[PDB]
């Protein structure tokens, strides 16, 4: 009978809500009211990167904090050198519709996808010297919204078929499949220890998955609309999700509930991309009002604004050393802020 | 030391990007949308994952993309198609059951914040099926406004009334709220659809340039 399962499911939901309320003895704002405000963080566009012909949806910094690969919808993955602004590589893609990209931790490989529903892995360390498609990972039924390398061999990718997939690049097949999401999975982020990862989807739910098992360890609710962005806290025990309800939301895994919501009345526009600084005190979030906001992760005060873009900011990422922030946009220009 | 080689590599990459820029600006991108019953498959097959078609008309290249490999949900990947010169929108004018679905989808595309600048080239296929249906299912049962509607085809004028009513519904959605709609009455077997897309894109780009050069 479906009705009894419905009753059991809503009873379990009420039990989870009651447990979260019982453990909600305080709030992050009340505890962090005594720490000094971060002040006004004025970030200037130290370097602006141009040659992308169409709007940029994807961007990922390298681990060396110098090279970054960015994907534009003209069918181009440009690997830059933000120190010198030189285009290290310009890979032409088979499918012009690219919605994600990744730079491997070793940096020998990059990845991409979008509507083609295929994760194209390209080799940047070819013996010949040119960049060619190392692999084409297919089985996704929908558009590939995000992809992140676990290492040279493994890659976890979220797609619009409401599932994620951990692939072995060498074999080219799904080592693991992650299902329970109800809507399109628009963004994921690997943990610092690269053991668990959170995926945000269009059903206003962020699911913390475990890689070695393949089952949803935790589910986080509180968002009001589609979650377009997600990133771990640098310590790995929390994450911030940006959504279409024009509010970011910081959740904690161990507490298993909302910690804080970052919003303002003047903001009525969705968040496209979210990242944390090296220490995690600043939550940089790109909005649709063509500007980004540097929220205080512990106070929620809008602690700066990055208003150098005249179109939608769709991707946003901070270097592993925290020396700079790249915020690609639909202008077709990246901008390295610092 | 290695800075010079990096500069030469950047120079080569920018030359390739300039060539790609000329190619990209030369061709015009189109987003073909419809439903399962809608005859967009025949349209894209006429001038022949994502089903792509390149067709050259009056030496202008048009790249039309039919995104059939995704799910029924399209509130996110549709944002991929704001750089398209136009959204080809295929509708079964002869299928009244699913015509309201087409109207809702057209309204959503029209009012989507990232598709506010994108003209919609509306192809009302199955005008022959619509004709035989009208001569033979009453549009009024699914559209009471048609009961009090007057015309603004050769076999009978009721077919004209029905097809222009559907056109007027779509144009009402278009005009009720920087981008225009270009409805067309096309049959399943027509060779002029490529020319229709050419003329509509000519008008769209003309209006874009007129806004650019400040005549509008």
């Amino acid at each position: 009978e479906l009705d009894q399962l419905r009753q059991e499911a809503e009873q379990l939901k009420n039990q989870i809500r009651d447990a979260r309320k019982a453990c909600a003895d305080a709030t992050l704002s009340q505890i962090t009211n005594n720490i000094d405000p971060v002040g006004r963080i004025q970030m200037r566009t130290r370097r602006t990167l141009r040659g992308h012909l169409a709007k940029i949806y994807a961007m990922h910094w390298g681990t060396d904090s110098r090279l970054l690969v960015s994907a534009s919808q003209d069918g181009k993955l440009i690997i830059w050198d933000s120190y010198t602004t030189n285009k290290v590589h310009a890979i032409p893609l088979r499918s012009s519709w690219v919605m994600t990209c990744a730079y491997a931790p070793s940096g020998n490989y990059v990845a991409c996808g979008g509507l083609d529903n295929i994760c194209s892995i390209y080799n940047l360390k070819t013996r010949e010297g040119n960049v060619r498609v190392s692999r084409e990972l297919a089985g996704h039924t929908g558009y590939l919204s995000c992809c992140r390398f676990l290492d040279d061999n493994q890659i976890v990718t979220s797609s619009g078929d409401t599932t994620c997939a951990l692939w072995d690049i060498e074999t080219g097949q799904q080592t693991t499949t992650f299902t329970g999401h109800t809507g399109d999975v628009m963004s994921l982020s690997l943990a610092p220890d690269t053991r668990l990862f959170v995926s945000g989807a269009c059903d206003a739910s962020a699911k913390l998955w475990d890689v070695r098992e393949g089952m949803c360890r935790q589910t986080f609710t509180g968002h009001e609309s589609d979650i377009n962005a997600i990133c771990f806290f640098p310590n790995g025990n929390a994450f911030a999700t940006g959504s279409d309800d024009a509010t970011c939301r910081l959740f904690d895994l161990r507490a298993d509930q909302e910690l804080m919501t970052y919003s303002h009345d003047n903001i009525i526009c969705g968040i496209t991309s979210v990242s944390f600084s090296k220490s995690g005190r600043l939550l940089l979030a790109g909005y649709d009002d063509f500007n980004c906001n540097v929220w205080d992760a512990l106070k929620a005060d809008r602690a700066g604004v990055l208003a150098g873009h005249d179109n939608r900011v769709s991707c946003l990422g901070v270097t592993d050393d925290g020396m700079a922030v790249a915020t690609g946009s639909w202008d077709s220009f990246l901008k390295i802020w610092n | 030391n290695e800075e010079k080689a990096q500069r030469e590599a950047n120079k080569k990459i920018e030359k390739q990007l300039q060539k790609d820029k000329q190619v990209y600006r030369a061709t015009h991108r189109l987003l073909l949308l419809g439903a399962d019953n809608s005859g967009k498959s025949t349209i894209v097959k006429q001038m022949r994952g994502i089903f792509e078609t390149k067709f050259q008309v009056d030496k202008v290249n048009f790249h039309m993309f039919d995104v059939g490999g995704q799910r029924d949900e399209r509130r996110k990947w549709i944002q991929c198609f704001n750089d398209v010169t136009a959204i080809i929108f295929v509708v079964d004018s002869s299928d009244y059951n699913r015509l309201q679905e087409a109207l809702n989808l057209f309204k959503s595309i029209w009012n989507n914040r990232w598709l506010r600048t994108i003209s919609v080239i509306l192809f009302l296929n199955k005008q022959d099926l619509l004709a035989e249906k009208v001569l033979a299912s009453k549009i009024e049962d699914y559209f009471p406004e048609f009961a009090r509607y007057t015309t603004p085809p050769g076999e009978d004028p009721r077919v004209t009334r029905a097809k222009y009513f559907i056109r007027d519904e779509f144009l009402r959605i278009s005009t009720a709220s920087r981008h225009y709609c270009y409805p067309h009455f096309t049959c399943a077997v027509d060779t002029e659809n490529a020319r229709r897309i050419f003329n509509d894109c000519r008008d769209i780009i003309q209006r874009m340039h007129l806004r650019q050069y400040e005549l509008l």
Epitope: A204, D245 | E73, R75, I78, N111
Partner: nanobody, 126 residues
Framework: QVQLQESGGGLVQPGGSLRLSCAAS????????MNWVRQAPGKGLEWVSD????????SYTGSVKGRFTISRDNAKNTLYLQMNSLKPEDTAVYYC?????????????????????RGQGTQVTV
Amino acid sequence: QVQLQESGGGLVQPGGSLRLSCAASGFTFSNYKMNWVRQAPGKGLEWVSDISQSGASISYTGSVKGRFTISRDNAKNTLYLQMNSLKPEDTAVYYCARCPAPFTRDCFDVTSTTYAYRGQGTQVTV
């Protein structure tokens, strides 16, 4: 979490009246364009009506104009569909979809098979 509990559906004779009320929890009601949709037996999702944020703009499918009345109470945080002179063809499971994002006036994917922001629905039969 975005949750929508419909109620009111049950047996009602042809030509009768029936009130469907959806209680919405987990989101700011005033900022979303609220939709009523239906799925008949052996048929796909069919959009019935929608009402804007403030209730000023209201629209219905042509098959129910002059028969169905969609309204919203933001203060009480609920949606209503007053269904008058029911026909045999009006039998369906009625869901209360929601605009995917605010403050947009475009209701994408409301009639999708697996739309997330939709109540589980109430059966209505005559």
